[PDB]
Design goal:
This is part of a larger assembly, with chains A (50 residues) and B (49 residues). Chain A is built from one helix and two strands; from the N terminus they run H-E-E. Chain B is an alpha+beta fold and 49 residues long. Chain B is built from one helix and two strands, in the order βαβ. The chains are: A alpha+beta (50), B alpha+beta (49). The interface between A and B is small, with 3 and 3 residues. It is classed as transport protein.
């Protein structure tokens, strides 16, 4: 859970997009606290429609 | 006693508007709020709307 937050902060300092692959925690689900981040898999909390 | 609020997306606007609404909900003063706006300039070429 740790390293993606440093990676996102370091990248978003310059406001460049980031593509996330192997994380689905809901801490990055927000669109405000983290400036730029993308997901290729549904978040861990998204399994509520099933 | 007449006002309206306009805001963009920032970390804490929701709590701001919630506090304003809750404070004006129960008071002995007559507060007249005319709608709330949540405009955003993120969209490209959206200045018309």
């Amino acid at each position: 859970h740790f390293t993606p937050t440093p990676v996102s902060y370091t990248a978003g300092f310059y406001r460049i997009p980031v593509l996330g692959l192997t994380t689905r925690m809901s801490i990055y689900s927000d669109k405000s606290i983290h400036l730029s981040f993308l997901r290729t898999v549904p978040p861990y909390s998204h399994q509520s429609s099933v | 006693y007449i006002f309206s609020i306009v805001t963009t997306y920032f970390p804490g606007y929701q709590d701001f508007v919630n506090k304003i609404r809750s404070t004006i909900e129960n008071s002995f003063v007559g507060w007249e709020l005319e709608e709330v706006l949540l405009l955003d300039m993120s969209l490209d070429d959206g200045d018309s709307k």
